[PDB]
């Protein structure tokens, strides 16, 4: 999960970052530049438990501590109080999160483009492999034309929909499409997934 960790580590310098992938798991981590820490949590009103704290070095000369929360405690829609404390008893982090509000899906797959028909491109893709409740996933399609233009269009795709019909595209231009995914409002939330494997296309006329 190094890709998602580093991707999320961009939005946060030194904060406790948590995310779930398929709603039956949870990973909380942070990075420092050593020291020893203990990870304690409380699912709803259940008694406090401890999480086995892993540690490994990351590039740029820094150590990363992460807790892989036990599957048995991956309950959504309930307050999960987290607390990282130092060996000296001094507090380090403190969050009250909901597992369903920190989703970081994988990148969408199966991107295909078609020229049909009226001078318009039909985009179709598939939701990330083995991902729960595909009908609650909304997407965002990025259109880049190149030649220094960059992103020229970004269309927001409604939840559940996996096809997009693009209009008003300039001819004799080589476009490149990409799709990203995330869980939809209001019963979910999280972060934008990585961009899908891009697909290029050359327009006629």
């Amino acid at each position, epitope marked *: 999960f190094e890709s998602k960790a580093a991707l999320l580590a961009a939005r946060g310098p030194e904060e406790l970052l948590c995310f779930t992938e398929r709603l039956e798991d949870l990973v909380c981590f942070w990075e420092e530049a050593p020291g020893q820490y203990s990870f304690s949590y409380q699912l709803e009103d259940e008694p406090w438990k401890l999480c086995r704290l892993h540690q490994a070095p990351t590039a740029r000369g820094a150590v990363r501590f992460w807790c892989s929360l036990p599957t*048995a405690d*991956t309950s*959504s*829609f309930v307050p999960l109080e987290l607390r990282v404390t130092a060996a000296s008893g001094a507090p380090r982090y403190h969050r009250v999160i909901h597992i369903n509000e920190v989703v970081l899906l994988d990148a969408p797959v199966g991107l295909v483009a078609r020229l049909a028909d009226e001078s318009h491109v039909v985009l179709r893709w598939l939701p990330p492999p083995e991902t*729960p*409740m*595909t*009908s609650h996933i909304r997407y965002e399609v990025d259109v880049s034309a190149g030649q220094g233009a960059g992103s020229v269009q970004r269309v927001e795709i409604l939840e559940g929909r996996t096809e997009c019909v693009l209009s008003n595209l300039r001819g004799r231009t080589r476009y490149t499409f990409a799709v990203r995914a995330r869980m939809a409002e209001p019963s979910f939330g999280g972060f934008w997934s990585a961009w899908s494997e891009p697909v290029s296309l050359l327009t006629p006329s």
Partner: antibody
Amino acid sequence: EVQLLESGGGLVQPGGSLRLSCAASGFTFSSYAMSWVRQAPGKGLEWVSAISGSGGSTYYADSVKGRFTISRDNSKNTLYLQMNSLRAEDTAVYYCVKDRVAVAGKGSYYFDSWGRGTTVTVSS
Amino acid sequence: QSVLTQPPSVSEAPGQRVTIACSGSSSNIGNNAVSWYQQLPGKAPTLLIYYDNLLPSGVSDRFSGSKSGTSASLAISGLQSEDEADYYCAAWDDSLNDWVFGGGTKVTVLA
């Protein structure tokens, strides 16, 4: 691999009492929550009661409030259901259901494993 | 009566396709995860479909689940005599605050 064995069910009359038991094995009992689900003919399945892993949190259906009492013994890996002041409408097959997480509720998404189920009959 | 509505009985010839509806509201099926359960006669209920469309490890490829608005459906393609059982749909309700189920659907296979 998960196995759930119900017991303590049979025939009683309105006002009677029974004590159901669920012998759980094949998994760590104290880490998951448990539920009781009954099926009367024409009423389908109903979520009767549920208890969290530590037993701190309990839920009861509105039709069994004050009459039923759910509990668990983590040392013995057994789920109990104390049925008092029984009514005719309590007549159903009571299933022992293991939850996915440590607390039964919305965040469970689904019921993973069911048991064979014991029958509770209430008549005159 | 049940909160979710299923057809009580459905009869179909072997090898065909069967569609079982499970209509609800905006509080149950509308924005919550739907689950399906199969109950073979005289046996324990098994998890058939979870997460609206996903399939548990060990379930036949012939079973599939879908969801549109306030209604979910179970599809049984290549109908066999082994599939002759009772099928329940379940989802959390937000208007209420408990699990709700359907009346159940008894799939009968002819000869």
